[model samples]
Target: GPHMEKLPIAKPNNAYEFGQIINALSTRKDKEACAHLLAITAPKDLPMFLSNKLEGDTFLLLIQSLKNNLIEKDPSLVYQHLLYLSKAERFKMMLTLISKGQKELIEQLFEDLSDTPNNHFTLEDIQALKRQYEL
Candidate 1:
């Protein structure tokens, strides 16, 4: 609903550079840096980069960066990114969040998804997904 101010000019030139930069940053555990990279990433490429490259903690960290940094600046993009994730990947990450006791983060994620204009994941859907994965 709100326009994001023009992001910085410098960004990874392509999806390959994008994953490489994050893979390097992934070691450092800095959400701001990860968030900045994501903010500047092209929408079409964002899903590709996410679905193909990042895995385990890196995927979780980048998603957390989207929660921690971009939610306030661009909620829609956050929802779009979540929507873009494949179901298996989404369930895997959510399971990690649950096992790690990141309840606040995951709850906020559910709330944010609920607020999406035409949400794909309803609250009931989330509960069912959680039940399935929690078992």
Candidate 2:
């Protein structure tokens, strides 16, 4: 219900770059362990394997193709992607979800942030919100 400023998302051309983006993500992971994981992930798909920028009719298709090109759909990875979105942008997505008949989750988000409707969430508060919503 409130507007929030946005953060830019990570754009990586190769797996190494994506792993770097992943390592930099704000999460509950241990920092040293995260860097180790990044080191291990550098070997896959290499640099030249995912160079295709194929056309698609739908936005999902386009996303899916590029998604198919790279790593598995890790939960933390998706969370990392979502972390780039502003609260307002996420609320907009939730509204779209409701419009498309996802009613089970309808009031969950509303209930989550209902206490402080106008409060700005700091990164720690955002992490708390993530844990509360299991986001």
lDDT string for model 2 (10-105, tens) is 445564554344433333223333333333442233222222321111112212222322223232332332233223223334334333333323
Residue clash pairs of candidate 2: none
TM-score list, all predictions: 0.63, 0.23
Whole-model lDDT values for every prediction:
0.62, 0.33
lDDT of 1 by residue, 1-135 (tens): 124433333687765777677776666676777788768876566656655565666676776887678877776666555555534344356555555566456556656656654434455654554344343
Give the distance in Å from residue 80's predicted Cα in candidate 1 to where it truly belongs: 1.0
lDDT of 1: 0.62
**Where is the poorest 10-residue window by lDDT in model 2?**
53-62
Clashing pairs in 1: none
RMSD of each candidate relative to the true structure = 6.8, 15.7
